[PDB]
Amino acid sequence: ATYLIGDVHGCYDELIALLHKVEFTPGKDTLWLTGDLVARGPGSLDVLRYVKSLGDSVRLVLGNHDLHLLAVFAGISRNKPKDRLTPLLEAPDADELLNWLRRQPLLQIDEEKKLVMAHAGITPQWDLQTAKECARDVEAVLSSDSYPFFLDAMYGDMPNNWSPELRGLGRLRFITNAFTRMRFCFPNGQLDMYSKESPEEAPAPLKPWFAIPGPVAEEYSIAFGHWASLEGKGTPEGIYALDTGCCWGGTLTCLRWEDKQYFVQPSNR
Ligand SMILES: [Mn+2]
Ligand SMILES: [Mn+2]
């Protein structure tokens, strides 16, 4: 069976309870995770240990909080107490866990399932070939010995419009923002980096990225997490918003792909 789970955010107890609910069995089953494995919940260290141990039985994409953790680890960014990352950062296996984490993809594709996953989704300005190339470029910098330089460069809100002519810092910043921070788009597909509200609360002319026709969404199902204020609701056919806000007192959601059956684990908070 194939299971897809939204942002875990250190909610290790809820993750394990949900996996036991579906009798997740590595070697027979595969788990897809939308990223944001860490921060806010209390168990980021246990989450990363478990997810790394799954090996080929997990398909992860990196989220904005995973990248922020890497930036803190590398001395690029300041540790915020509310993220509760200190046990992970001080763990004796922190190097092993975080060097594993920075080698994971920004994008997962299963052609037999016609299924694509990224943390925030797929901008309508990208076709599949471009999404693949952009994921490869950022994965290459994150997996290199020089990844702290990229982590420092990644912060920023511009450029917010894709072009194949983008180069250098702006190209990487756009790619990172599209995969890990996107929510709303302008009608032409350009990213808005400020509004984090539900679609009903957003100001015109902002619309969700998935409300703008794009070539990937037209051919593939897209699963994503990230946008907690969506509460997993309000998406069109073939768009699966899996982040139902477990770390916020909401729920952890798991979708089984074969029958599109949902399973939900209440937050312990
Ligand atoms: Mn999140
Ligand atoms: Mn996120």
Swiss-Prot record:
Recorded superkingdom: Bacteria
Source taxonomy: Bacteria, Pseudomonadati, Pseudomonadota, Gammaproteobacteria, Enterobacterales
What GO terms in the biological process aspect are recorded for it? nucleobase-containing small molecule interconversion; response to X-ray; RNA decapping
Q: What is this protein called?
A: Bis(5'-nucleosyl)-tetraphosphatase [symmetrical]
Q: Which Gene3D superfamilies match?
A: 3.60.21.10
* Activity regulation text: Co(2+) is a strong stimulator (100-fold increase in rate of hydrolysis). Mn(2+), Cd(2+), Ni(2+), Mg(2+) and Ca(2+) are weak stimulators; the two latter act synergistically with Co(2+).
**Subunit structure, per the record?**
Monomer.
Q: Which InterPro entries match?
A: ApaH (IPR004617), Calcineurin-like_PHP_ApaH (IPR004843), Metallo-depent_PP-like (IPR029052)
Q: Carries keyword Hydrolase? A: yes
- Species this protein is from: Escherichia coli (strain K12)
The molecular function terms in GO held by this entry are: bis(5'-nucleosyl)-tetraphosphatase (symmetrical) activity; bis(5'-nucleosyl)-tetraphosphatase activity; hydrolase activity; phosphatase activity
Q: Please provide, in alphabetical order, the Gene Ontology terms of the cellular component aspect for this entry.
A: cytoplasm
* HAMAP family per record: ApaH (MF_00199)
Which keywords accompany this UniProt record?
A: Hydrolase
What Pfam families would the database entry show? Metallophos
**EC code:** 3.6.1.41
Q: Which family does it belong to?
A: Belongs to the Ap4A hydrolase family.
Catalytic reaction equation(s): P(1),P(4)-bis(5'-adenosyl) tetraphosphate + H2O = 2 ADP + 2 H(+)
Membrane-crossing residues?
Answer: none
| SS bonds (residue pairs) | none
Q: What does this protein do?
A: Hydrolyzes diadenosine 5',5'''-P1,P4-tetraphosphate to yield ADP.
